[PDB]
Amino acid sequence: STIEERVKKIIGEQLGVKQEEVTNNASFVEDLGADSLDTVELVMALEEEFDTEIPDEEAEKITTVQAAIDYINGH
Amino acid sequence: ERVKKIIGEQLGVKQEEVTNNASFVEDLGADSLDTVELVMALEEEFDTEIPDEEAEKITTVQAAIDYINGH
Amino acid sequence: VSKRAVITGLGIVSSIGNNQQEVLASLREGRSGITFSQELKDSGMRSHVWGNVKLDTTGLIDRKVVRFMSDASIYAFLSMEQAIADAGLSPEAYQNNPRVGLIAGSGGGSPRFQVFGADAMRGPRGLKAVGPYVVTKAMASGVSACLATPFKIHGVNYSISSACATSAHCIGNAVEQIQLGKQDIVFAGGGEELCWEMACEFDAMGALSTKYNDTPEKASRTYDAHRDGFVIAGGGGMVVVEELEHALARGAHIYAEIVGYGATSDGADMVAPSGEGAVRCMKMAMHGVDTPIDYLNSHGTSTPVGDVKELAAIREVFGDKSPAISATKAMTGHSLGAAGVQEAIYSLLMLEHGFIAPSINIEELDEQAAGLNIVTETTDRELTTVMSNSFGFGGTNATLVMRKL
Amino acid sequence: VSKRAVITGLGIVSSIGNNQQEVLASLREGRSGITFSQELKDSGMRSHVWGNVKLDTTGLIDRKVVRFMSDASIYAFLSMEQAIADAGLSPEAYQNNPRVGLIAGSGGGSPRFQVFGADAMRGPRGLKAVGPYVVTKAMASGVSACLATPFKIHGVNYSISSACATSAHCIGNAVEQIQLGKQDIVFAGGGEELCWEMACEFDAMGALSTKYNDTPEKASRTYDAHRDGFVIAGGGGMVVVEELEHALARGAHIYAEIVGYGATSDGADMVAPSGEGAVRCMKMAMHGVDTPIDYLNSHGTSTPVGDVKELAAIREVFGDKSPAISATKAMTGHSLGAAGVQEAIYSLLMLEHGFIAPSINIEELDEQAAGLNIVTETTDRELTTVMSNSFGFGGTNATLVMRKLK
Ligand code: NA
Ligand code: NA
């Protein structure tokens, strides 16, 4: 699978939404109902999946699906 | 033979009734959970190993001192 | 007035059934719930049998609420779903209601996630592998915290812990809230997980059954002359405790009325019960009850010591008017934190359907048990008043007396 | 009718003192108990500050009794020893007495001893190296079970757990035992241990303070505009809850009467309080109290969001008649399951000695905090009624009201 759809898969099962609702411009909080604790576990599942380490200052920048795809694509 | 010191602090006596025939139960008031700990504390002072079916027979104090002198 | 309390609904997930119908069938047939455990063997234990919940829980609960739940909270959640539907309580009747509370507890949270949290910390990842969910899964009030939120409980909400008398004290505490006029409905119960992390320390004390690993259904053998320790078990349970006038006005189905509740303490030995505390606990629950006791669900662990001390207490309480006795732990094992609410549910099923479940695995009755009426075969009988004992580590005791209206 | 409950004795082992005399001195001065922790730094945590118990416990408890105990049970035992003497009770009066109970719980139990047994189970020795005292140390009812046996309690005996409202619910259920006429004396309280095996779980959620590891004394800063999480702490506490006539019969020293107890659940968000449940919890405790509230011991704890939400609940209940407010956690930290009984003892000492402990470390007061009397300096004043709030994970709430007898 492509990098883009591997992130969308992870976001889907971590927040509990369908894959169709996981579009690129969708934000985690207001669109996918992610609370404050879901954001912490989400970045943990991305950094367990592509074998990358995300600094906390940059993890707080990741608030949309595109932002998560852009970070994994750039590293 | 510092066995009398460990047994004294393990059971709660001022190191007095330390004879050969002193049982741990009716003479030193050792709980059955304490008899398991009494074994345990002996390995911390000397690196040795005791099986299981042999431990149930062991209920003497002089045997512990003699076991240590031989190990 | 005094305010009376009744049971209007129950739910259970135990090793002998995933609901009260499956439990009712197992109780009649006397079918054991003990099975061989590969997990207990691979971990290095001596006991290889347990009373496991024969049910996969993957996906049964919504993701937004199962993310905080250990196994103890999951079994209790599924049990409360059953109790809510059995009591006929609509959502607008128990949700967002200050007069509706919940008192459920576990024996000791979840050692599995306790050990998992420390393994990830010391690992190479560090805090990145711990996760923000271990706190709710490892704390002692996780059962009450994880359940009060999705069910929108507005009343009282806390957890009680008292070793194997845990969920028994929760029910007694619920009756007290109804008697004090604080609540109209209180969900009471508990849950327990089943893992090697929690069972291994029982094996280190030498309290688990290790001589019947090749035949698991014969391991839990209460009152038999050849017992060697109790069988670890897990599950959950939940009962709906309701004020009497509140239940009558809404046409609820009433199982029984909790006419007595005893709760004492031994204050003698940490591991060995004395007996005097169990007598006061039983006599406290019988005070004010005119009808005799027809059935007694004893605590009966199947241990070489604690089995006889309860029989001596029962003998002093009743004397010659010995009620029918049976230990259901021979079928289900010891669910610890959930034993009190599960055994109260078994006793309510006996009272509801008019039978007495047998105390199985008795090949030779112990000599110190003679003279008592220990039922070994299922008996049809119109029961009126039943009693269940629940003893706990530390000398704490609990007793519940239930009677039909 | 209805039986009345009073406090006839107290004991405390906290991070600002090892008895009610030391604790009283720290409250009037405003001394913080937060220090630097090398263990939290060695384990790889982001927070390096805590409120530890500055006390040596080697030889204070008998070997036959301490062998079953974890650090949570040791702090509660030492607290119960002080409370019994402070109440003027002798073993002939409380031992082997069915009318004397004990309700004391912990936040969870003991993660340190649970981890120690798992490492030994997986070690080279195996089951033999686990030891026979891991059950008693790691179970949730360890505090009550390790205490009811040495003190020979014959009444009720169990533990209540409700996150950080734990020991407040214990006190509330002690009062109910007296009101129902089932007990004459109930010892209520709790304890909590302090180790990295427990604190590292809160650091994973980001609930601990990590920006002030160099200046630990100003880390816990409730109601300050630059807060970033609570500071973990430990200790224990125990109060003697007794029936009024029984206390007046033996001529006991009575601190205050428990005139109100509130206990609610939010049922909304589990990690963020709702405030609605806090309003119902305060009104239920104030029901029947004709005298006004002079002092309010807030839960506070210097959390980024839960600080202002509790303040809105106070304004909704009191309106223009706002009482004096101060968060003692700015000095002591958050002792989790012991906070309820410890903050209740802080309110008792202030009521007994007529003063108000300050809410320290406030440099820039935050928004929606203006309009309330957040007392920042130690103000001497004769009080007659106090109040202490306690919240916990799961949306659970507890409230106690204490009033002098006059
Ligand atoms: Na029973
Ligand atoms: Na408070």
Asked if C287 reaches chain A (Cβ–Cβ under 8 Å), the answer is no
Distance (Å, rounded) from C-alpha D401 to C-alpha C255? 38
Domain ranges for chain B? 2-70
For B40, the closest of D62, D63, D131 (CB atoms) is D131
If you measure CA to CA, which chain A residue comes closest to D202?
A37
Beta-carbon contacts of residue D108 (< 8 Å; ≥ 6 apart): C109, C138, C139, C140, D140, D161, D198, D337
Indicate the DSSP class of residue B22.
-
Selected catalytic residue, list B31, B47, B52, B66: B31
Distance (Å, rounded) from C-alpha D392 to C-alpha D337? 9
If you measure CA to CA, which chain C residue comes closest to A43?
C128
Distance (Å, rounded) from C-alpha C101 to C-alpha C238? 13
- Please check whether residue D237 is in contact with residue D336, taking contact to mean a CB–CB distance below 8 angstroms: no
If you measure CA to CA, which chain C residue comes closest to A33?
C64
Give the Å distances, CA to CA, from A5 to A22, A23, A50, A51, A52: 10, 10, 13, 16, 17
Distance (Å, rounded) from C-alpha C8 to C-alpha A55? 54
Q: Do C270 and D141 touch (CB under 8 A)?
A: no
- Please check whether residue D282 is in contact with residue D317, taking contact to mean a CB–CB distance below 8 angstroms: yes
- Please check whether residue C20 is in contact with residue C10, taking contact to mean a CB–CB distance below 8 angstroms: yes
Tell me the ligand closest to D391's alpha carbon.
Answer: 2
Cα angle vertex B63, ends B62, B65, to 5°? Answer: 65
The DSSP string of C210-234 is -S-SSSGGGT--TTBTT---BPBB-
Instruction: Report phi then psi at C153, rounded to 5.
Output: -75, 130
Write out chain C residues lying below 8 Å of B25, CB-based. none
Task: State the residue for tokens 């709660």.
Answer: B12
Q: Domain B2-70 is in which class?
A: mainly alpha
For D64, the closest of B12, B36, B40 (CB atoms) is B12
From the number of C-beta atoms within 10 Å of its C-beta (0-12, 13-18, 19+), residue C102 rates as buried
Asked if B16 reaches chain D (Cβ–Cβ under 8 Å), the answer is no
Distance (Å, rounded) from C-alpha C208 to C-alpha B52? 15
Partners of D241 in the beta sheet? D7, D186
Domain ranges for chain C? 7-260, 261-405
Distance (Å, rounded) from C-alpha D148 to C-alpha D135? 16
Question: Taking chain D, what is the end-to-end CA distance rounded to the nearest angstrom?
Answer: 18
List helix spans (H) across C297-371.
306-318, 329-332, 339-353
Contact exists between A and B (3 or more beta carbon pairs < 8 Å)? no
Residues C305-317, buried b or exposed e (16+ Cβ, 10 A)? Answer: ebbbbbbebbbeb
Q: Do A37 and D204 touch (CB under 8 A)?
A: no
For D163, the closest of C134, C141, C202 (CB atoms) is C141
Write out chain B residues lying below 8 Å of D67, CB-based. 34, 37
Q: Do C132 and A37 touch (CB under 8 A)?
A: yes
Asked if C129 reaches chain A (Cβ–Cβ under 8 Å), the answer is yes
- How many angstroms separate the CA of residue A22 from the nearest CA in chain C? 17
CA of residue C299 to ligand 1 center, whole Å: 4
- Please check whether residue D85 is in contact with residue D127, taking contact to mean a CB–CB distance below 8 angstroms: no
Discontinuities in chain D with C to N beyond 2.5 Å fall right after none
Distance (Å, rounded) from C-alpha D257 to C-alpha D344? 12
The DSSP string of D252-289 is ----EEEEEEEEEE--S-SSS--SHHHHHHHHHHHTT-
- How many angstroms separate the CA of residue C359 from the nearest CA in chain B? 29
Residues D248-264, buried b or exposed e (16+ Cβ, 10 A)? Answer: eeeebebbbbbbbbbbb
- How many angstroms separate the CA of residue C311 from the nearest CA in chain B? 23
CA of residue D344 to ligand 2 center, whole Å: 7
A56 annotated active-site: no
Q: Do A40 and C132 touch (CB under 8 A)?
A: yes
Distance (Å, rounded) from C-alpha C183 to C-alpha D170? 18
CA of residue C223 to ligand 1 center, whole Å: 14
Tell me the ligand closest to D343's alpha carbon.
Answer: 2
**Comparing C-alpha atoms, which of A69, A21, A24, A14 is closest to residue A44?**
A14
Which SS3 state, helix, strand or coil, does residue C254 take? coil
Asked if D271 reaches chain A (Cβ–Cβ under 8 Å), the answer is yes
Selected catalytic residue, list C146, C164, C170, C281: C164
Asked if C321 reaches chain A (Cβ–Cβ under 8 Å), the answer is no
- Beta carbons within 10 angstroms of residue D157's beta carbon: 32
Which SS3 state, helix, strand or coil, does residue C322 take? coil
- How many angstroms separate the CA of residue A17 from the nearest CA in chain D? 20
Distance (Å, rounded) from C-alpha D44 to C-alpha C113? 19
A–D CB contacts, 8 A cutoff, strictly below: 9
Tokens of A14: 């971590």
Q: What is the resolution of this structure in A?
A: 2.2
If you measure CA to CA, which chain A residue comes closest to C68?
A37
- Beta carbons within 10 angstroms of residue D309's beta carbon: 16
Give the Å distances, CA to CA, from D160 to C75, D148, D190, D254: 20, 15, 9, 25
Partners of C35 in the beta sheet? C50
Residues A29-61, buried b or exposed e (16+ Cβ, 10 A)? Answer: eebbebbebbbbbbbbebbeeeeeebeeeebee
**Comparing C-alpha atoms, which of C48, C16, C13, C20 is closest to residue C31?**
C16
Indicate the DSSP class of residue C241.
E
User: Which of C128, C157, C175, C179 has the most D C-beta neighbours within 10 Å, making it the best mutation to test the interface with D?
Assistant: C157
**Comparing C-alpha atoms, which of D305, D354, D348, D303 is closest to residue D329?**
D303
Distance (Å, rounded) from C-alpha C258 to C-alpha C80? 19
Partners of C230 in the beta sheet? C208
C164 annotated active-site: yes
How far does CA D235 lie from the centroid of its chain? 9
**Structurally, what CATH architecture does the domain formed by A3-74 represent?**
Orthogonal Bundle (1.10)
> In one letter, which amino acid is C120?
A
Partners of A27 in the beta sheet? A64
**Comparing C-alpha atoms, which of D347, D163, D388, D140 is closest to residue D266?**
D163
- How many angstroms separate the CA of residue B36 from the nearest CA in chain C? 8
Distance (Å, rounded) from C-alpha D340 to C-alpha D172? 10
Q: Do D204 and A35 touch (CB under 8 A)?
A: no
- How many angstroms separate the CA of residue A1 from the nearest CA in chain C? 25
Contact exists between D and A (3 or more beta carbon pairs < 8 Å)? yes
What H or E segment, with its residue span, contains residue D9?
A: strand D5-13
- Please check whether residue D350 is in contact with residue D68, taking contact to mean a CB–CB distance below 8 angstroms: no
From the number of C-beta atoms within 10 Å of its C-beta (0-12, 13-18, 19+), residue B5 rates as exposed
